[PDB]
Design a protein around this nucleic acid. Structure first.
Ligand SMILES: N[C@@H](CC(=O)O)C(=O)O
Ligand SMILES: [Mg+2]
Ligand SMILES: [Mg+2]
Ligand SMILES: [Mg+2]
Ligand SMILES: [Mg+2]
Ligand SMILES: [Mg+2]
Ligand SMILES: [Mg+2]
Ligand SMILES: [Mg+2]
Ligand SMILES: [Mg+2]
Ligand SMILES: [Mg+2]
Ligand SMILES: [Mg+2]
Ligand SMILES: [Mg+2]
Ligand SMILES: [Mg+2]
Lengths: 66, 116, 70, 88, 103
RNA sequence: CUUGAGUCUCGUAGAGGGGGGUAGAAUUCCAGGUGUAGCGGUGAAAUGCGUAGAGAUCUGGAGGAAUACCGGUGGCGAAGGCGGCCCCCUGGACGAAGACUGACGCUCAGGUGCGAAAGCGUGGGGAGCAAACAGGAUUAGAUACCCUGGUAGUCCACGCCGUAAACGAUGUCGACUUGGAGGUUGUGCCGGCGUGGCUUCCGGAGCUAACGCGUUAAGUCGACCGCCUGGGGAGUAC
C-alpha cells in the first residue's frame, strides 16, 4: 500500500517521467493494479493516462513481444 | 544437410492438438512433428503424453542439422505446453530461453458460447 | 513472459520459473476468457456476482471468528 | 460557457452596478448571450442531443425570468426585450 | 492563447535537420506573438518498439503558448513532413518552464 | 424580507455529448521464403481444408472492426447509455469565500423532445461474428442443441421506427426520524479533528401479508401527476 504520489505530493504524473512509470508496469508491460501497488484511485487514473501516453511515444512498450 | 547448431522450437499447443516446429533463428523451418501424426487420434491426440511423443519425433526429424542450443517459443493454452518443453530437454538440446508468445487481442468478436 | 535461462541453472527450476511467469501474467486465463463471446449483460452479471460473493465471504469470516464450534 | 470578459461586459451593460450580477435583466442578458452563441455550435453539431438539453434549459430559464419580470414591472421588461431583440 | 506541449520525434537519418526545423517552428509561433516557454532537444534515443522499421528517433520537446489556430499549421506541418515520424500536441493548464525528467 | 429558487467570481473530478486525427495488439485475406503430411473439429466423428504443398514458421502488404492490462457493488449522464490516446466544439454536477436578485417555487393532463437492440429506406463499407441457408452428425424423429461453412445484419452518413425484464419490477419535489462499516470527489484546521456532494453493504425503531425496506425508506408527513379494480377472452377485435 502507501500510495507514493500523495506521499510525494505529485500534481501530475508526467508521462515523460519514465523513471517513475517503469515501477508501475509488469515485466511484460501491463499496468499494475492499484490494489497491488496501493496507489490512490485519483493517481492511479493519471498513472494509466501517463503510461498510455508514453506507450504512444515509444518511451514505454505496449507488450513484451514487439 | 546444413549445420546450424542454433534453432528455435515453436510449440503450438491447442486444446485439440500440439504442433512442434523447429526453425532456425531466421524463422525457416527445419522439421516438424504433431501429436496427431504421432499415432494419436481423438482423445489421445490432446493429451500431454501425445505432445511428448510429438516433441521427440521433431527432435528426431532435425537430427541431421546438428542443433545444439534451442530457444522455445510456446503458444496456445493446450495440455501439451509443459510436457513438450521437457521432452526437448530429454532429447539433449540446451534450452537457452523459454517464452510465451500466445497472441492476445488488445480485436475481433469471438465465436458464440457453446450450449452443450 | 520471457524467461532467459541463467548460468549453472538446472532445467526444471527454470521450467518452474517459466510456469510462474506465465501465471503471474495470467495469460492462460486470458486465452480461456477470450475463446467464446461474452455478452455485456453476462459479464456484468458475473462481475456483480463476484463482488457480492467476495463481500459475503469476508463478513462470514469476520462473523465466524466470533464463534465457537464446541 | 461565456468568457468572464463577456460576462463582465454584460454585467456592467445591464446591471445598475458591476456587482449586480443577480438582477433579472443581467440573468436574461447572460442567458441570451449564451443561447445565441450556441446557435453556431448546433448548426454544425445537430446530433448533439446531450448538449442541446442544456441549451433548452437556458431557453426555459430565460422564459421563466421574463415571465417574472413582465408581471413585476412592465417598464423594465419592454426596455429589456428590445435591447436583446426578443419577440417576447 | 492556450498552452501546448509538443513532443515530436524525427527520423534518425535527418537529425541534422532537427536544429533547423526548430527555428522554423519557433519563427511560426513567435511570428504570431506566441511564446516559447520550454524547448528541449532529447537527441537520439532508443525506441521501445519499431516505428516504420526504425529503432531510434530524435525527440524534441517544446512548451509554447500560442493562439490555437497557429498550432494547426504545426500539426499540418508535422503531418506532411516525412522527417517527422510521430508527434503529439497536448493542452497544458499553465506554462511549464522547468526541465523534463529526461534532462 | 431572505432561509426556497437563481446569477457572478476561483477551482475540482468525470467512459457526459458532437466532430476530426492517430497508435498498438489480434483475426482474416493477398504475395513470397523454409518445410512436409497432415490440419481442423468433436463426447466420438464426419463434413471441410491439404501433396495443385496445407497446417506450422518467417517477411512484406491490404483491410475492417473492437480498444487487453489500468478496471474497481469505480466514474459521468434525465433516461436509453458512455471505455485506447490527442485536439476542436459543447452540457451538466460539486466545493470554498463572499456579493447580487428577491420566493421569482413545485408538479404537470394535452403538447414537445430524447429514447437499447432488432428492423426499415438511400448511399457506402464488410475483417471477425452471424439470423436465413447448405452440408456433417446426434436422434425413433432432431425443421434443434454440437460441427463445418455462410448471406442479410452487425460498421459509417442521413432519414424512419418508438418498442425492451426501457427494472430499483420502487413517479417527481420538499421536510423530519437511532447507528455501524466502506468507496469516491472537494474543502477547513492541526497522520489527527471537522465539514460538503455522490455512492455500496449491514442493521434499529417504524412499516410490511411475508419476503423484506430501513436517513438514497417500502418510516412520519405535505404538493402535484400517472395508474389499478377477479382469471381467461385480450393489450385482442373494430
Ligand atoms: N480485446 C479488446 C478489443 C480488441 O479485441 C477488448 O476485449 O475490448
Ligand atoms: Mg469453435
Ligand atoms: Mg451556470
Ligand atoms: Mg404526457
Ligand atoms: Mg440498430
Ligand atoms: Mg441498413
Ligand atoms: Mg445499403
Ligand atoms: Mg453455427
Ligand atoms: Mg437497461
Ligand atoms: Mg438493471
Ligand atoms: Mg411498469
Ligand atoms: Mg437494510
Ligand atoms: Mg394492437
Amino acid at each position: 500500500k502507501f500510495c507514493r504520489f500523495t506521499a510525494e505530493g505529485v500534481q501530475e504524473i508526467d508521462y515523460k517521467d519514465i523513471a517513475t512509470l517503469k515501477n508501475y508496469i509488469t515485466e511484460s508491460g501491463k499496468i499494475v493494479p492499484s490494489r497491488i501497488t496501493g496507489t490512490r484511485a485519483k493517481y492511479q487514473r493519471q498513472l494509466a493516462r501517463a503510461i498510455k501516453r508514453a506507450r504512444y511515444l515509444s518511451l514505454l512498450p505496449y507488450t513484451d513481444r514487439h | 544437410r546444413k549445420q546450424v547448431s542454433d534453432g528455435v522450437a515453436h510449440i503450438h499447443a491447442s486444446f485439440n492438438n500440439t504442433i512442434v516446429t523447429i526453425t532456425d533463428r531466421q524463422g525457416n523451418a527445419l522439421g516438424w512433428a504433431t501429436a496427431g501424426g504421432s499415432g494419436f487420434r481423438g482423445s489421445r491426440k490432446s493429451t500431454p503424453f501425445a505432445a511428448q511423443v510429438a516433441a521427440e519425433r521433431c527432435a528426431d526429424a532435425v537430427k541431421e542439422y546438428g542443433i545444439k542450443n534451442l530457444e522455445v517459443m510456446v503458444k496456445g493454452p493446450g495440455p501439451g505446453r509443459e510436457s513438450t518443453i521437457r521432452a526437448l530437454n530429454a532429447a539433449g538440446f540446451r534450452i537457452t530461453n523459454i517464452t510465451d508468445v500466445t497472441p492476445i487481442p488488445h480485436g475481433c468478436r469471438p465465436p458464440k458460447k457453446r450450449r452443450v | 513472459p520471457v524467461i532467459k535461462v541463467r548460468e549453472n541453472e538446472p532445467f526444471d527450476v527454470a521450467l518452474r520459473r517459466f510456469k510462474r511467469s506465465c501465471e503471474k501474467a495470467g495469460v492462460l486465463a486470458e486465452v480461456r476468457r477470450r475463446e467464446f463471446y461474452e455478452k455485456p449483460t453476462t459479464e456484468r452479471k458475473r462481475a456483480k456476482a463476484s463482488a457480492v460473493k467476495r463481500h459475503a465471504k469476508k463478513l462470514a469470516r469476520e462473523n465466524a471468528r466470533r464463534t465457537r464450534l464446541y | 460557457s461565456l468568457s468572464t470578459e463577456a460576462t463582465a461586459k454584460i454585467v456592467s451593460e445591464f446591471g445598475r452596478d458591476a456587482n449586480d450580477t443577480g438582477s433579472t435583466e443581467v440573468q436574461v442578458a447572460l442567458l441570451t448571450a449564451q443561447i445565441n452563441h450556441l446557435q453556431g455550435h448546433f448548426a454544425e453539431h445537430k446530433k448533439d442531443h446531450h448538449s442541446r438539453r442544456g441549451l433548452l434549459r437556458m431557453v426555459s430559464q430565460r422564459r421563466k425570468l421574463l415571465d417574472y419580470l413582465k408581471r413585476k414591472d412592465v417598464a423594465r421588461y419592454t426596455q429589456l426585450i428590445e435591447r436583446l431583440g426578443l419577440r417576447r | 492563447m492556450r498552452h501546448y506541449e509538443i513532443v515530436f520525434m524525427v527520423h534518425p537519418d535527418q537529425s541534422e535537420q532537427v536544429p533547423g526545423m526548430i527555428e522554423r517552428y519557433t519563427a511560426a509561433i513567435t511570428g504570431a506573438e506566441g511564446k516559447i516557454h520550454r524547448l528541449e532537444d532529447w537527441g537520439r534515443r532508443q525506441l521501445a518498439y519499431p516505428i516504420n522499421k526504425l529503432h531510434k528517433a530524435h525527440y524534441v520537446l517544446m512548451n509554447v503558448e500560442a493562439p490555437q489556430e497557429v498550432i494547426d499549421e504545426l500539426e499540418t506541418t508535422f503531418r506532411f513532413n516525412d522527417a517527422v515520424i510521430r508527434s503529439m500536441v497536448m493542452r497544458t493548464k499553465h506554462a511549464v518552464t522547468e526541465a523534463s525528467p529526461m534532462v
